JSON list of C-alpha atoms in Angstrom, two decimals:
[
{"chain": "A", "resi": 1, "resn": "UNK", "atom": "CA", "xyz": [-10.77, 14.73, -19.11]},
{"chain": "A", "resi": 2, "resn": "UNK", "atom": "CA", "xyz": [-10.85, 10.84, -18.31]},
{"chain": "A", "resi": 3, "resn": "UNK", "atom": "CA", "xyz": [-8.13, 11.45, -15.91]},
{"chain": "A", "resi": 4, "resn": "UNK", "atom": "CA", "xyz": [-10.49, 13.71, -13.61]},
{"chain": "A", "resi": 5, "resn": "UNK", "atom": "CA", "xyz": [-13.43, 11.83, -14.30]},
{"chain": "A", "resi": 6, "resn": "UNK", "atom": "CA", "xyz": [-11.55, 8.71, -12.42]},
{"chain": "A", "resi": 7, "resn": "UNK", "atom": "CA", "xyz": [-11.08, 10.68, -9.50]},
{"chain": "A", "resi": 8, "resn": "UNK", "atom": "CA", "xyz": [-14.90, 12.20, -9.43]},
{"chain": "A", "resi": 9, "resn": "UNK", "atom": "CA", "xyz": [-16.81, 9.10, -10.19]},
{"chain": "A", "resi": 10, "resn": "UNK", "atom": "CA", "xyz": [-14.38, 7.35, -7.57]},
{"chain": "A", "resi": 11, "resn": "UNK", "atom": "CA", "xyz": [-15.40, 10.50, -5.25]},
{"chain": "A", "resi": 12, "resn": "UNK", "atom": "CA", "xyz": [-18.83, 9.19, -5.83]},
{"chain": "A", "resi": 13, "resn": "UNK", "atom": "CA", "xyz": [-18.61, 5.97, -4.85]},
{"chain": "A", "resi": 14, "resn": "UNK", "atom": "CA", "xyz": [-16.78, 6.85, -1.39]},
{"chain": "A", "resi": 15, "resn": "UNK", "atom": "CA", "xyz": [-19.85, 9.07, -0.87]},
{"chain": "A", "resi": 16, "resn": "UNK", "atom": "CA", "xyz": [-22.52, 6.37, 0.07]},
{"chain": "A", "resi": 17, "resn": "UNK", "atom": "CA", "xyz": [-20.41, 4.86, 3.19]},
{"chain": "A", "resi": 18, "resn": "UNK", "atom": "CA", "xyz": [-22.61, 6.89, 4.80]},
{"chain": "A", "resi": 19, "resn": "UNK", "atom": "CA", "xyz": [-19.16, 8.79, 6.69]},
{"chain": "A", "resi": 20, "resn": "UNK", "atom": "CA", "xyz": [-18.42, 12.28, 6.52]},
{"chain": "A", "resi": 21, "resn": "UNK", "atom": "CA", "xyz": [-15.79, 11.64, 9.00]},
{"chain": "A", "resi": 22, "resn": "UNK", "atom": "CA", "xyz": [-13.85, 8.98, 6.12]},
{"chain": "A", "resi": 23, "resn": "UNK", "atom": "CA", "xyz": [-10.20, 9.49, 5.51]},
{"chain": "A", "resi": 24, "resn": "UNK", "atom": "CA", "xyz": [-10.18, 7.95, 2.53]},
{"chain": "A", "resi": 25, "resn": "UNK", "atom": "CA", "xyz": [-12.97, 10.43, 1.72]},
{"chain": "A", "resi": 26, "resn": "UNK", "atom": "CA", "xyz": [-11.56, 12.92, 2.52]},
{"chain": "A", "resi": 27, "resn": "UNK", "atom": "CA", "xyz": [-8.39, 12.50, 1.09]},
{"chain": "A", "resi": 28, "resn": "UNK", "atom": "CA", "xyz": [-9.70, 11.66, -2.34]},
{"chain": "A", "resi": 29, "resn": "UNK", "atom": "CA", "xyz": [-11.84, 15.04, -2.11]},
{"chain": "A", "resi": 30, "resn": "UNK", "atom": "CA", "xyz": [-8.24, 16.59, -1.55]},
{"chain": "A", "resi": 31, "resn": "UNK", "atom": "CA", "xyz": [-7.11, 14.61, -4.45]},
{"chain": "A", "resi": 32, "resn": "UNK", "atom": "CA", "xyz": [-9.57, 15.89, -6.43]},
{"chain": "A", "resi": 33, "resn": "UNK", "atom": "CA", "xyz": [-8.60, 19.53, -5.15]},
{"chain": "A", "resi": 34, "resn": "UNK", "atom": "CA", "xyz": [-4.97, 19.44, -6.40]},
{"chain": "A", "resi": 35, "resn": "UNK", "atom": "CA", "xyz": [-7.14, 17.49, -9.48]},
{"chain": "A", "resi": 36, "resn": "UNK", "atom": "CA", "xyz": [-8.87, 20.77, -10.13]},
{"chain": "A", "resi": 37, "resn": "UNK", "atom": "CA", "xyz": [-6.55, 23.05, -9.45]},
{"chain": "A", "resi": 38, "resn": "UNK", "atom": "CA", "xyz": [-3.88, 21.74, -12.07]},
{"chain": "A", "resi": 39, "resn": "UNK", "atom": "CA", "xyz": [-6.40, 21.57, -14.96]},
{"chain": "A", "resi": 40, "resn": "UNK", "atom": "CA", "xyz": [-7.55, 25.10, -14.16]},
{"chain": "A", "resi": 41, "resn": "UNK", "atom": "CA", "xyz": [-4.18, 26.70, -14.01]},
{"chain": "A", "resi": 42, "resn": "UNK", "atom": "CA", "xyz": [-3.31, 24.95, -17.48]},
{"chain": "A", "resi": 43, "resn": "UNK", "atom": "CA", "xyz": [-6.36, 27.08, -18.71]},
{"chain": "B", "resi": 1, "resn": "UNK", "atom": "CA", "xyz": [-8.77, 3.42, -12.66]},
{"chain": "B", "resi": 2, "resn": "UNK", "atom": "CA", "xyz": [-11.62, 3.23, -9.89]},
{"chain": "B", "resi": 3, "resn": "UNK", "atom": "CA", "xyz": [-12.34, -0.36, -9.51]},
{"chain": "B", "resi": 4, "resn": "UNK", "atom": "CA", "xyz": [-8.59, -0.67, -8.10]},
{"chain": "B", "resi": 5, "resn": "UNK", "atom": "CA", "xyz": [-9.11, 1.85, -5.57]},
{"chain": "B", "resi": 6, "resn": "UNK", "atom": "CA", "xyz": [-12.88, 0.85, -4.30]},
{"chain": "B", "resi": 7, "resn": "UNK", "atom": "CA", "xyz": [-11.49, -2.95, -4.42]},
{"chain": "B", "resi": 8, "resn": "UNK", "atom": "CA", "xyz": [-8.01, -1.86, -2.15]},
{"chain": "B", "resi": 9, "resn": "UNK", "atom": "CA", "xyz": [-10.50, 0.51, -0.04]},
{"chain": "B", "resi": 10, "resn": "UNK", "atom": "CA", "xyz": [-12.77, -2.99, 0.42]},
{"chain": "B", "resi": 11, "resn": "UNK", "atom": "CA", "xyz": [-9.91, -4.67, 1.57]},
{"chain": "B", "resi": 12, "resn": "UNK", "atom": "CA", "xyz": [-8.51, -2.10, 4.05]},
{"chain": "B", "resi": 13, "resn": "UNK", "atom": "CA", "xyz": [-11.82, -1.26, 5.46]},
{"chain": "B", "resi": 14, "resn": "UNK", "atom": "CA", "xyz": [-12.97, -5.01, 5.93]},
{"chain": "B", "resi": 15, "resn": "UNK", "atom": "CA", "xyz": [-9.38, -6.12, 7.37]},
{"chain": "B", "resi": 16, "resn": "UNK", "atom": "CA", "xyz": [-12.10, -6.87, 10.24]},
{"chain": "B", "resi": 17, "resn": "UNK", "atom": "CA", "xyz": [-15.41, -7.36, 9.79]},
{"chain": "B", "resi": 18, "resn": "UNK", "atom": "CA", "xyz": [-17.16, -3.95, 11.16]},
{"chain": "B", "resi": 19, "resn": "UNK", "atom": "CA", "xyz": [-20.97, -4.98, 10.93]},
{"chain": "B", "resi": 20, "resn": "UNK", "atom": "CA", "xyz": [-21.85, -0.88, 10.53]},
{"chain": "B", "resi": 21, "resn": "UNK", "atom": "CA", "xyz": [-20.96, -0.40, 6.79]},
{"chain": "B", "resi": 22, "resn": "UNK", "atom": "CA", "xyz": [-21.25, -3.99, 6.03]},
{"chain": "B", "resi": 23, "resn": "UNK", "atom": "CA", "xyz": [-24.57, -3.76, 4.02]},
{"chain": "B", "resi": 24, "resn": "UNK", "atom": "CA", "xyz": [-23.29, -1.04, 1.96]},
{"chain": "B", "resi": 25, "resn": "UNK", "atom": "CA", "xyz": [-20.58, -2.18, 1.47]},
{"chain": "B", "resi": 26, "resn": "UNK", "atom": "CA", "xyz": [-21.89, -5.04, -0.70]},
{"chain": "B", "resi": 27, "resn": "UNK", "atom": "CA", "xyz": [-24.44, -2.19, -2.73]},
{"chain": "B", "resi": 28, "resn": "UNK", "atom": "CA", "xyz": [-21.08, -0.62, -3.34]},
{"chain": "B", "resi": 29, "resn": "UNK", "atom": "CA", "xyz": [-19.61, -3.63, -5.04]},
{"chain": "B", "resi": 30, "resn": "UNK", "atom": "CA", "xyz": [-22.73, -5.03, -6.98]},
{"chain": "B", "resi": 31, "resn": "UNK", "atom": "CA", "xyz": [-23.01, -1.62, -8.17]},
{"chain": "B", "resi": 32, "resn": "UNK", "atom": "CA", "xyz": [-19.76, -1.57, -9.17]},
{"chain": "B", "resi": 33, "resn": "UNK", "atom": "CA", "xyz": [-19.41, -4.69, -10.87]},
{"chain": "B", "resi": 34, "resn": "UNK", "atom": "CA", "xyz": [-22.86, -4.37, -12.41]},
{"chain": "B", "resi": 35, "resn": "UNK", "atom": "CA", "xyz": [-21.06, -1.58, -14.31]},
{"chain": "B", "resi": 36, "resn": "UNK", "atom": "CA", "xyz": [-18.14, -2.54, -15.65]},
{"chain": "B", "resi": 37, "resn": "UNK", "atom": "CA", "xyz": [-19.73, -5.74, -17.11]},
{"chain": "B", "resi": 38, "resn": "UNK", "atom": "CA", "xyz": [-22.16, -3.79, -19.26]},
{"chain": "B", "resi": 39, "resn": "UNK", "atom": "CA", "xyz": [-19.33, -1.81, -19.95]},
{"chain": "B", "resi": 40, "resn": "UNK", "atom": "CA", "xyz": [-16.92, -4.09, -20.98]},
{"chain": "B", "resi": 41, "resn": "UNK", "atom": "CA", "xyz": [-19.26, -6.07, -23.14]},
{"chain": "B", "resi": 42, "resn": "UNK", "atom": "CA", "xyz": [-20.36, -3.23, -25.02]},
{"chain": "B", "resi": 43, "resn": "UNK", "atom": "CA", "xyz": [-16.83, -2.45, -25.20]},
{"chain": "B", "resi": 44, "resn": "UNK", "atom": "CA", "xyz": [-15.81, -5.61, -26.43]},
{"chain": "B", "resi": 45, "resn": "UNK", "atom": "CA", "xyz": [-19.21, -6.16, -29.09]},
{"chain": "B", "resi": 46, "resn": "UNK", "atom": "CA", "xyz": [-18.33, -2.47, -31.11]},
{"chain": "B", "resi": 47, "resn": "UNK", "atom": "CA", "xyz": [-14.67, -3.77, -31.07]},
{"chain": "B", "resi": 48, "resn": "UNK", "atom": "CA", "xyz": [-16.47, -6.49, -33.21]},
{"chain": "B", "resi": 49, "resn": "UNK", "atom": "CA", "xyz": [-18.39, -5.22, -35.37]},
{"chain": "B", "resi": 50, "resn": "UNK", "atom": "CA", "xyz": [-15.28, -2.35, -35.86]},
{"chain": "B", "resi": 51, "resn": "UNK", "atom": "CA", "xyz": [-13.12, -5.60, -36.96]},
{"chain": "B", "resi": 52, "resn": "UNK", "atom": "CA", "xyz": [-16.14, -6.78, -39.13]},
{"chain": "B", "resi": 53, "resn": "UNK", "atom": "CA", "xyz": [-16.43, -3.97, -40.78]},
{"chain": "B", "resi": 54, "resn": "UNK", "atom": "CA", "xyz": [-13.08, -4.81, -43.32]}
]
């Protein structure tokens, strides 16, 4: 759970750049999506 | 885990001086450090009480 929480909080602070086009933010979102996919596949 | 990525993002995005995300960056840094220091201090005090318990 804490592994997912890490990327979650990371993307949360990546929000506050006030950029919706930041490649860092997009890539961290891609990371979190695959993280959630791998966690749900385990269930 | 969050701290090491935020700081790497700080080094990468502020190799040079972008004036636009300058003000937000200080807020982000203040927020994350004020979180982490409190976390560490509470963890140390809890560990001290756990050590004293024996």
